[PDB]
């Protein structure tokens, strides 16, 4: 297991994919044009995990970029490291969804899907040990949610033995203009619970809260968040871009993380917290690093884990520090809060350490938390949704595009059983 | 029929079929198969002067349907500030009950539209009005996860 093929679609999804490829193309040492300008070979032992090699010291990001809006691609060309993308891999539609799921799933996405499948095909025809597929998108809009879920379904029925990883973001009436979002959300969840393997959850509400209270940015722009997400992405991909025994490939990653097939919704978190282009003079230590990255003030989804219990956790520390200090603080948080861990799964928190730190930091810490508290995030949507589907607003959009209307209440019964599933494994003692 | 065209006229958002259809004697408040007036549909999907020229042509500023929703239910829920301000300017209802027990403040609160709560409360919203599940309007904010909605409900 080595090669990971990456894909970005939708406004939000393409944006965050760009931020990702920026920070990781710098950390791996690739210059903007596409030649290795690093220092340490630690950045090339597992470089093949995210780049194909065009002969001649050309590191081509094994990636694909899609949108139903013909514009979008412009924001790519202005991306400072955007020329490195392979020409064939640019597949951009020209209709546009306009915040409509069924337009992206049953209508126009149904037309561009087979155009993406062929570039994905010729991407897999040149991979030694193709791991799985790794996607970035958003749930409240039109293109990303729908066309994404359809793509995942077709890849799933053509590649059943390859890991299915998705980095999905959340709508909330704090950043979303329109309010057609509590529909596309529940649809996307309906497909994700049934077709994906791993799934990372990022709430726009959390990023707004962090940008306002911590970073003191009263007027949050739309890149202020992409910074915050790209950081977490480097943190959780460290286990796959650098060598190490823990979380080698994605299969191993899900193995120590997925207790039940459906429950696979994580709540990332990073410490410390910084704005853009602002380094840390008093860079953080260790007890504040782990004392922060397990508190809620640094989590990436609007979910207070102190209400729920952790099923599994995978902590990752980057930089140069003491190993004993790491494992000691880990177990200290564990046993001083053994009331927050399912005692019927033991050895549930796995922590690795990587040498190379992220950019702008000397010591960092990433968090990945499959908690039982994540149901609070799904009890919110099934509230914005049951309050809008009991009224049937905007249903002529979807239903008037080949969609069944009951494929909605299907998703309400599905998610409302999921909530009961996270509540199930919250009070089950080891009897 | 001449009420159908007005119903889908204020729903699709138009200036012409709300100017010279009520001119032919079209039912200004003609409903459909469950009870939506062209004011529910002009306030709902996001249209302005259709609710200013409709609410001055005889539109009931408190009309209901099969489950009990009013034009303020269907404007505080979606999130159109000016349509709730104008719908309240004519004397709408801020404490209307429907078959599931929800009030327009519960719906503007659930959908996280906060200035609609800022004006729905200042125009007399009842924080002690409960629903089919026994939760007040201040009982939506502490279960949501939104502090900015619980700050306006305790002020
Ligand atoms: N953090 C962040 N959120 C975004 C961005 N773009 C869109 N969103 C969110 O995603 C939702 C849908 O917007 P959009 O991306 O245009 O829809 P889509 O591309 O069809 O999925 C909205 O509610 C936004 O809050 C972005 O660049 N950053």
Curated annotation (Swiss-Prot), chain A:
**Localization in the cell:** Cytoplasm, Cytoskeleton
InterPro entries per UniProt: Beta-tubulin_BS, Beta_tubulin, Tub_FtsZ_C, Tubulin, Tubulin/FtsZ-like_C, Tubulin/FtsZ_2-layer-sand-dom, Tubulin/FtsZ_GTPase_sf, Tubulin_C
GO CC terms: cytoplasm; microtubule; microtubule cytoskeleton
Q: Which cofactor(s) are needed, names only?
A: Mg(2+)
Post-translational modifications: Some glutamate residues at the C-terminus are polyglycylated, resulting in polyglycine chains on the gamma-carboxyl group. Glycylation is mainly limited to tubulin incorporated into axonemes (cilia and flagella) whereas glutamylation is prevalent in neuronal cells, centrioles, axonemes, and the mitotic spindle. Both modifications can coexist on the same protein on adjacent residues, and lowering polyglycylation levels increases polyglutamylation, and reciprocally. The precise function of polyglycylation is still unclear.
Omega-N-methylarginine modification sites are 318
Question: Which parts of the sequence carry N6-acetyllysine?
Answer: 58
> Which superkingdom does the taxonomy of this entry point to?
Eukaryota
- Phosphoserine sites (modified residues): 40, 172
The entry sums up its family as follows: Belongs to the tubulin family.
Q: What is known of its domains?
A: The MREI motif is common among all beta-tubulin isoforms and may be critical for tubulin autoregulation.
State the name under which the record lists this protein. Tubulin beta-2B chain
């Amino acid at each position: 297991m080595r090669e990971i093929v990456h894909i970005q679609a939708g406004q939000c999804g393409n944006q965050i994919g760009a931020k990702f490829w920026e920070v990781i193309s710098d950390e791996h040492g690739i210059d903007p044009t596409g030649s290795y300008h690093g220092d340490s070979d630690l950045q090339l032992e597992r470089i093949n995990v995210y780049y194909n090699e065009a002969t001649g010291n050309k590191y081509v990001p094994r990636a694909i970029l899609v949108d139903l809006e013909p514009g979008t691609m412009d924001s790519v060309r202005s991306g400072p490291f955007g020329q490195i993308f392979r020409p064939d891999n640019f597949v951009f539609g020209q209709s546009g969804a306009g915040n409509n799921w069924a337009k992206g799933h049953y209508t126009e996405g149904a037309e561009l899907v087979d155009s993406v499948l062929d570039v994905v095909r010729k991407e897999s025809e040149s991979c030694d040990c193709l791991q799985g597929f790794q996607l970035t998108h958003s749930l409240g809009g039109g293109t990303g949610s729908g066309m994404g879920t359809l793509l995942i379904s077709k890849i799933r029925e053509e590649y059943p033995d390859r890991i299915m990883n998705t980095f999905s973001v959340m709508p909330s009436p704090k950043v979303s203009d329109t309010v057609v979002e509590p529909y596309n959300a529940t649809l996307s969840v309906h497909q994700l619970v049934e077709n994906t393997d791993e799934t990372y959850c990022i709430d726009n509400e959390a990023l707004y809260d962090i940008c306002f209270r911590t970073l003191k940015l009263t007027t949050p722009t739309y890149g202020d968040l992409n910074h915050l997400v790209s950081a977490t992405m480097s943190g959780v991909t460290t286990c796959l871009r650098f060598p190490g025994q823990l979380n080698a490939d994605l299969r191993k990653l899900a193995v120590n993380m997925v207790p039940f097939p459906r429950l696979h919704f994580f709540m990332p978190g990073f410490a410390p917290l910084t704005s853009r282009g602002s380094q840390q003079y008093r860079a953080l230590t260790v007890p504040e690093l782990t004392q922060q990255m397990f508190d809620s003030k640094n989590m990436m989804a609007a979910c207070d884990p102190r209400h729920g219990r952790y099923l599994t956790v995978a902590a990752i520390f980057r930089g140069r520090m003491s190993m004993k200090e790491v494992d000691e603080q880990m177990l200290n948080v564990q046993n001083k809060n053994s009331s927050y861990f399912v005692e019927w799964i033991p050895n549930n928190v796995k922590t690795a350490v990587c040498d190379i730190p992220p950019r702008g930091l000397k010591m960092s810490a990433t968090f990945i938390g499959n908690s039982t508290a994540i149901q609070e995030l799904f009890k919110r949507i099934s509230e914005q949704f049951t309050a809008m589907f009991r009224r049937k607003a905007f249903l002529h959009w979807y239903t008037g595009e080949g969609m069944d209307e009951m494929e909605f209440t299907e998703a309400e019964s599905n998610m409302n059983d999921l909530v009961s599933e996270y509540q199930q494994y919250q009070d089950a003692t080891a009897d | 029929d001449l009420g159908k065209k007005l119903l889908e006229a204020a729903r699709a958002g138009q200036d012409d079929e709300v100017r010279i259809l009520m001119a032919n004697g079209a039912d200004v408040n003609a409903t459909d198969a469950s009870g939506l007036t062209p004011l529910h549909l002009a306030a709902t999907y996001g249209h302005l002067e259709i609710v200013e020229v409709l609410l001055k042509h005889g539109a009931d500023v408190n009309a209901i349907d099969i489950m009990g929703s009013t034009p303020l239910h269907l404007a505080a829920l979606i999130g159109h500030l000016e349509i709730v301000e104008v719908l309240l300017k004519h004397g709408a209802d801020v404490n209307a009950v429907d078959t599931w027990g929800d009030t327009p403040l519960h719906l503007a609160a659930i959908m996280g539209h906060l200035e609609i709560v800022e004006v729905l409360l200042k125009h007399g919203a009842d924080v002690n009005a409960q629903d089919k599940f026994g939760k007040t309007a201040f009982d939506i904010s502490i279960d949501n996860g939104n502090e900015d909605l619980a700050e306006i409900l305790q002020k």
